């Protein structure tokens, strides 16, 4: 399973089971460019969020109701949607994944 494999290898579920996590299959340069695209408010009300002009290939990884450490279980949902990321620093780079529309 891509999600079980990737989450593990990325040290994401090595010491616990992360309930949800999205993976972006676009280049890093192209994802970093979103920080200068459409400004929107994060779900929390913050406004340092940016929505990508176009849709991007992403894979949603969600734990199943049965999942329990050490045996984490994820459902793999591949899709193409706009991504919304929060940006900070200098340069202005993504630091959080807010959502995918």
């Amino acid at each position: 399973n891509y999600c079980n494999q990737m989450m593990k290898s990325r040290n994401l579920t090595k010491d616990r089971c992360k309930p949800v996590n999205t993976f972006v299959h676009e280049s890093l340069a192209d994802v970093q460019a979103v920080c200068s695209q459409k400004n929107v408010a994060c779900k929390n009300g913050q406004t340092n969020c940016y929505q990508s002009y176009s849709t991007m290939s992403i894979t949603d990884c969600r734990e199943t109701g049965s999942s329990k450490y050490p045996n984490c279980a994820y459902k793999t949902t591949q899709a193409n949607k706009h991504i919304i990321v929060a940006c900070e620093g200098n340069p202005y780079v993504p630091v959080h994944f807010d959502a995918s529309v």
Binding site: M6, R10, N11, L12, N21, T22, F23, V24, H25, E26, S27, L28, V31, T59, V85, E88, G89, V93, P94, V95, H96, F97
Partner: peptide, 15 residues
């Protein structure tokens, strides 16, 4: 060691 931008890359990037 790991910064917020670095953490985002490791957790969400898979070009």
């Amino acid at each position: 060691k790991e910064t917020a931008a670095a953490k985002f890359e490791r957790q969400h990037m898979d070009s």
